[PDB]
Amino acid sequence: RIIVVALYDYEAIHHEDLSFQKGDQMVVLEESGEWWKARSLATRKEGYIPSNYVARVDSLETEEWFFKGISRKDAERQLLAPGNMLGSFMIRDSETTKGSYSLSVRDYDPRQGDTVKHYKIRFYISPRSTFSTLQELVDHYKKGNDGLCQKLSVPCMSSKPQKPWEKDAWEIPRESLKLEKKLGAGQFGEVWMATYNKHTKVAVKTMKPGSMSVEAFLAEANVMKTLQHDKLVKLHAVVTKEPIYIITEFMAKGSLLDFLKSDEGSKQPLPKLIDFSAQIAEGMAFIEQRNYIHRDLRAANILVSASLVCKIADFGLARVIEFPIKWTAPEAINFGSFTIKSDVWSFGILLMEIVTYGRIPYPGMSNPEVIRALERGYRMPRPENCPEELYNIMMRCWKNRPEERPTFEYIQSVLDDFYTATESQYEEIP
Ligand SMILES: Nc1ncnc2c1c(-c1ccc(Oc3ccccc3)cc1)cn2C1CCOCC1
Ligand SMILES: [Ca+2]
């Protein structure tokens, strides 16, 4: 008999899902992945709940200061998001020391600014002050920092998870959709802001009938479906009848390209710009890991969400299609040799795009002009706002030999800790 508890409020919007409040306990009846069958102990109604909205009671996830499955960098991203304050903390699964836990505390370093320190935990931090349960431990450091950068104040602002897509609805009838407002158009189709079943806001990429076979496209789209990651835009559904529709999550601030050119973009300081490209490297590192290829990496194909999380879009679409030579590796231009390494070349350009708030690559140069320019060994010069060490990375991405260019794993690893000396990742306690 398994009892779970609601971590967040939820309002039902389908035929057979349950509405519950934060705290309502429930009996699990089935575990079908994203959706679980359950019985509210509050209503006595049996229905479907979003599995990721509840956790076993007295389990750690139930706690407000615990964050399951969070990396150190993301732990550091959520503590620097507005709404938190000096002393804001959290406990999480440690990356390096598996099966153990780590403590992340907000802090102010008069020389860096707002930062986030991390401590490991074996339970105890300092063999001085030992503790029986993370609760005891937590409540301790809440009064007078026991040697910690700061004193534990308020748990980290937690977000409300996205609602899982309707149960078993990868392919939808076109009627389930109202494409309300057109956001963009182009050679291959448009992108619309849409609503799915009067209830769910979404984005739709409509594909002009090319060929680009339909059953050819759908094969890719089923692989596309399996490439899920916090840094890839999420494919919800597909309409399989020419003209094909691709239904995805709606990203509020549109393309990275468009965001960097806007007002809010222009205010973003350099450490933010760096973080953006770090997020994209994380996404590209995932694609690399899964032995996949993007083939059209650039600011235009990066989406920005309301909270400034970057997500790659159009991954794979490039393959299935049917003129951006400025983002393309010489080997891909000359012999059509698209690989993860040519993506890396792309990342280099996209990276310059970012640091120059979306300015076009090779300004004032034509495509032909640039193609010959590259053959002479020409590269874009470092912009003024650009740190020397960041430029050295672009240059590494633009090595004539693909084999010589770094991996996204390495690029991700470097960008993430750009301002943190390796020895300073975790703290050593007195
Ligand atoms: N999903 C989106 N949400 C919000 N804005 C979006 C998108 C999308 C978008 C929607 C679906 C899509 O389809 C995919 C997604 C992943 C892989 C393959 C195709 C790709 C981008 C584009 N855009 C704007 C529209 C044109 O101006 C700048 C970008
Ligand atoms: Ca420097």
Ligand SMILES: [Cl-]
């Ligand atoms: Cl019962």
